[PDB]
Subunit: 229 residues, 4 copies
Amino acid sequence: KFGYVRQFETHDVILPQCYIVVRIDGKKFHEFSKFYEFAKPNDENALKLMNACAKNLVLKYKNDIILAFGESDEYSFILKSSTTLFNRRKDKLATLFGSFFTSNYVALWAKFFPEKPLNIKHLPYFDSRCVAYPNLQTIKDYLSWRYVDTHINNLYNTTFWQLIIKCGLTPQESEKKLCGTFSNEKQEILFSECGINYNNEPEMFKKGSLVTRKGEILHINVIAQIDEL
Amino acid sequence: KFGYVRQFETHDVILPQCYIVVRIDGKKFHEFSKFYEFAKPNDENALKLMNACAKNLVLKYKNDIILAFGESDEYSFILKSSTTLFNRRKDKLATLFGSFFTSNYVALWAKFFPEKPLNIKHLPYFDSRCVAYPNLQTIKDYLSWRYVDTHINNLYNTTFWQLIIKCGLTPQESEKKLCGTFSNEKQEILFSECGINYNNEPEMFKKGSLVTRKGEILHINVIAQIDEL
Amino acid sequence: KFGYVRQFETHDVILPQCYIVVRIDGKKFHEFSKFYEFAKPNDENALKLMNACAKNLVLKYKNDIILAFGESDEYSFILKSSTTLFNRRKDKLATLFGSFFTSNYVALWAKFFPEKPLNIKHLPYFDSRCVAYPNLQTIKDYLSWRYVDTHINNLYNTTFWQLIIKCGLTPQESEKKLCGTFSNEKQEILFSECGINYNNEPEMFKKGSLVTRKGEILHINVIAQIDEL
Amino acid sequence: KFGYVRQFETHDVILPQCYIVVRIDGKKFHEFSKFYEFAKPNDENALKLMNACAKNLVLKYKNDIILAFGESDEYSFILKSSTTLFNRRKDKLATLFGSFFTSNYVALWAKFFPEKPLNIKHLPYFDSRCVAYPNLQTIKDYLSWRYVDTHINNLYNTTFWQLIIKCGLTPQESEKKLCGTFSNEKQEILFSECGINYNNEPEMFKKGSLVTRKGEILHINVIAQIDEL
Ligand SMILES: Nc1nc2c(ncn2[C@@H]2O[C@H](COP(=O)(O)OP(=O)(O)OP(=O)(O)O)[C@@H](O)[C@H]2O)c(=O)[nH]1
Ligand SMILES: Nc1nc2c(ncn2[C@@H]2O[C@H](COP(=O)(O)OP(=O)(O)OP(=O)(O)O)[C@@H](O)[C@H]2O)c(=O)[nH]1
Ligand SMILES: Nc1nc2c(ncn2[C@@H]2O[C@H](COP(=O)(O)OP(=O)(O)OP(=O)(O)O)[C@@H](O)[C@H]2O)c(=O)[nH]1
Ligand SMILES: Nc1nc2c(ncn2[C@@H]2O[C@H](COP(=O)(O)OP(=O)(O)OP(=O)(O)O)[C@@H](O)[C@H]2O)c(=O)[nH]1
Ligand SMILES: [Mg+2]
Ligand SMILES: [Mg+2]
Ligand SMILES: [Mg+2]
Ligand SMILES: [Mg+2]
Ligand SMILES: [Mg+2]
Ligand SMILES: [Mg+2]
Ligand SMILES: [Mg+2]
Ligand SMILES: [Mg+2]
């Protein structure tokens, strides 16, 4: 009857024998972490909750997910190249993982933050993406890339917010001080002038949250994913 | 450094000057509605909640949404043929609307169901799609199609469940009984044997839930949407 | 047995109810035309060959083509927004039109250039493209855009080559010479110094080449394609 | 000015680090070879024409092709997993090989068939396609799939037409006579009843036509393509 409109849709699928990354990146989590007054560069609970949602998800698809890695508002799920999940539908993959994740976020909020509840006008909601990785080397480098990303970001943010806190700086000059440095330089700027050793930093913050199937862990890259299969 | 993995993504975008439909349809909502013991054929609270999320979602993007229409676990949001929202990106449209709606559902569950709190192991989560409609007639027809679908379904399901309830039938001979029947025939099964008149069914069940901008109403297809532009 | 590799293909199609443009443009036609000594930026024979090919093509699909417009090495074919040809498929439409065209080119060459035969090492070969246009305006404007292009460029290159030919200019100072000018300014540069009038330039050069179904004509935009339906 | 129409085009490309195949299959080659009265089901000259074309094609892009394999009206060209050609664009790869090839066919037709020239109303034109293969296994299997199809088809069609030709059979009873047979059974039907030995059938008909870079060979699968890289 009016059914012909269904003609217009698109059911496109990810290429066979490719890994699938589904990545989830929270929308405006700058302002979102501002409103609920998160813990500044790093909120132990906010990050842990992310981990919770991620764990529940890889638990949910325990067969198709090799592992996951979370950063800020972001979390990444690796789908084995052989997966038939959702008949390899991009939309279904992305949207469904995202909704499920979002749903676990909202659900589990009460546990991690009895402090400040959700109000309404300001809510979490997340982006989701399907990315095709044809061979193992690429997935490995993808995962690495995220890991880099977290490393750099925590470094910069940490030595930035210490300067404001400890040395009383404004956002402008704390930036100029940090401009053009190295990884090591900032760690010195942390160690002497901010007076804090960066290795003494908690390990979930530096090296990011990596969920294998079930129980989850935090360390660098040694690719023993090579072994897990 | 590793950044070339971003080389693998796809930013594909809805063709310019096309109306957009972002459709949301809950996953495994049969099991969902069974576990929380929804009101079978129709749960007033459930549908209303759905409506709440919708109202908040067209509120959120006021500029780009013409209107929305909800059915069961489904909602359809129309975007204006000229919209730049999220730069016309399929992924972002779909996934973001999905997260948001979902987020809204889990938030407002506390409100609509003090009866049964959420547990965990059963959580609401929804699928999302983008569709591209090159002209007004098709988008119109689309909406029509949805409405038709809700009218037909509601009639079948209603005479089905009143057969089971009132006359104590098993699903099978209720199916074969209902098999190959017609409109007036179902409604006849309804009033005589099931002792209930169909026109007195709440309007929101029969004709579905239509969200215009801000507040929302429930009737058929008469295109007064044609006038609002 | 090995047949699974077939499952790797992609069957993607043009969104329904969109006019379709198929554009053909010959690769390296600068070097090509330079090799075969085409006449300056205007060769009656080459353009007539192109037109003949296109005439053959709209002859071939008389059912799906509204009309077609040639400029240089370019030819654009407008398929009706309703067409089901090749089931609306990109690969088939681009490559098949391209092939067909290329084949007619190479066929009818001996006709249009009995002067010089084809050699081998340099052969005509053409890029083809599929574009979707969701309504009338867009299509009209596309066509416009093309006609525009042919008109403008006919003027610029004409006066350029007269500056080189008649006035003995080198390209560089002919370019700085023509730089910044206007339409009638250029026509004057043509009329006084180079001794030719641009209104008597052949209407096929100026207003571009246009083929409706069957017989073909050259003028501007008066969109009388409006009526044909 | 009208330029916005260009914003409707589509740049979609092949996923990085995938072998590409460009396959070429002439539309309606049944009627073409019927019209030009080709040789039963194997025309030596037709095949070598096809071959010279593909050689010129691999010749043209010597950098990005591992090799090419032709069968009937078909030819397949394997592009290396790392290729940047046409910036990996679907449209350009398909249409360009399509057109070059078509051009080469029509050109070198003179050489291969001095017997009957091309006419007009019946002209060769070819469908072209792109396929992405994420790994060597699959590209190998692709090729295998092809060689398989040609071997199988050559036997079936050969004893088919020998049954028609020599024993005076009509297509129906040849079709049944051949129905459900095995390889060796068919070669029998060939040796006892049609009087011909399928071992002495020309290796270019049986084992297909394989172009490595430059000069080209006909044998089976022994993948020394593994070493050439
Ligand atoms: N305060 C605070 N913010 C966090 C924390 N974890 C993540 N975030 C926020 O999330 C951001 C991560 O980068 P983005 O995802 O690009 O920020 P975004 O603006 O929310 O996301 P987009 O709109 O997609 O660009 C940071 O700027 C933080 O503000 C945290 O533990 N504490
Ligand atoms: N009992 C009850 N069920 C509802 C209500 N609203 C929606 N539903 C359920 O939602 C379903 C709608 O159909 P689908 O969305 O295709 O069901 P689904 O199995 O969850 O979805 P998929 O797994 O993606 O195919 C119905 O079968 C209903 O059971 C309600 O108000 N009451
Ligand atoms: N000499 C001559 N050249 C022509 C004529 N018509 C078209 N051309 C050539 O066609 C070109 C038109 O632009 P393009 O199609 O972009 O040329 P191209 O660089 O060979 O094509 P691409 O590689 O696809 O960009 C001019 O540079 C001319 O060299 C003609 O009548 N005479
Ligand atoms: N007689 C003859 N036919 C050949 C030869 N080589 C290829 N063919 C034709 O090639 C065809 C291969 O299949 P297709 O190309 O799919 O046939 P088609 O109907 O012409 O093409 P499509 O419309 O694309 O399906 C066979 O039907 C043959 O008729 C040959 O050497 N001799
Ligand atoms: Mg973000
Ligand atoms: Mg981020
Ligand atoms: Mg559903
Ligand atoms: Mg449904
Ligand atoms: Mg060109
Ligand atoms: Mg041009
Ligand atoms: Mg064919
Ligand atoms: Mg074939």
